[PDB]
Amino acid sequence: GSVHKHTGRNCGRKFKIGEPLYRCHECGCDDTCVLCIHCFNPKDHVNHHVCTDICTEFTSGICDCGDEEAWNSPLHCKAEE
Ligand SMILES: [Zn+2]
Ligand SMILES: [Zn+2]
Ligand SMILES: [Zn+2]
């Protein structure tokens, strides 16, 4: 694959139509906190309750990876691998 790293800052990627928005019940500050497919690292959430949503004209947002205020635990952005 190919994915731009966002080292030293937040991701902030705006989801595109069709793309998944990952939430983790355990890691997320709250239910608005999401991760894009570039960033979500399955290894961070092996023992966690995760769910995906699908971006539509009406379900939108930006990825919170590397926004320290949005997560209860250190994430290891997938792009860094
Ligand atoms: Zn992201
Ligand atoms: Zn990331
Ligand atoms: Zn998690």
Q: CA 50, CA 52: separation in Å to the nearest integer?
A: 7
What residues are designated binding site for Zn(2+)? 6, 11, 24, 27, 36, 39, 45, 48-49, 63, 65, 77
- Full DSSP string of 2-58: -----TTS---PBPPTT-EEEEETTTBSSTT--B-TTT--GGGSTTS-EEEEE--SS
Q: Which ligand is nearest to the CA of 15?
A: 1
Query: Could you tell me the distance, in angstroms and rounded to a whole number, from the CA of residue 57 to the centre of ligand 2?
Result: 23
- In angstroms, this model's resolution equals 1.8
With a CB cutoff of 8 Å and minimum separation 6, the contacts of 72 are 26, 27, 28, 29
Q: CA 35, CA 27: separation in Å to the nearest integer?
A: 11
Domains of the chain (ranges plus CATH)? 11-81 (2.10.110.30)
Query: Could you tell me the distance, in angstroms and rounded to a whole number, from the CA of residue 50 to the centre of ligand 3?
Result: 7
Query: Could you tell me the distance, in angstroms and rounded to a whole number, from the CA of residue 52 to the centre of ligand 3?
Result: 13
String of b and e for 8-47 (b: at least 16 CB within 10 Å)? eebbebebeeebbbbbbeebbeeeebbbbbbbbbeebbee
